[PDB]
């Protein structure tokens, strides 16, 4: 084997008045069901990235335990998008 990677980042926008656990993205996404984490209450949602076809990748959304306000995003697979797709 040729190999797959997982990366993590934390999201939390300062500018907006209210924090949403389902916030807006630069690109569209598709959502799958949600499943619980044992020992950590906080449902983890499964999402896929939809922007422009040919994009390989899947992602999961999780909430920070430090503070419920911060969001954790785990991306698998690389993302390649066309700027015109946003318009699009
Ligand atoms: Zn993507």
Swiss-Prot record:
Induction (UniProt): Strongly during leaf senescence. Repressed by rhizobacterium B.cereus AR156 in leaves, and to a lower extent, by P.fluorescens WCS417r.
Location of the DNA-binding region in this protein: 18-84
Tissue expression from the record: In young, mature and senescent leaves.
Sequence intervals crossing the membrane: none
Organism superkingdom: Eukaryota
Null mutant phenotype: Reduced rhizobacterium B.cereus AR156-induced systemic resistance (ISR) to P.syringae pv. tomato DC3000 associated with reduced jasmonic acid (JA)-mediated signal pathway. Plants lacking both WRKY11 and WRKY70 are totally impaired in B.cereus AR156-mediated ISR.
Subcellular location(s) of the protein: Nucleus
Family as reported in the entry's similarity comment: Belongs to the WRKY group II-d family.
Functional description taken from the UniProt entry: Transcription factor. Interacts specifically with the W box (5'-(T)TGAC[CT]-3'), a frequently occurring elicitor-responsive cis-acting element. Regulates rhizobacterium B.cereus AR156-induced systemic resistance (ISR) to P.syringae pv. tomato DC3000, probably by activating the jasmonic acid (JA)- signaling pathway.
Protein name: Probable WRKY transcription factor 11
This protein's encoding gene: WRKY11
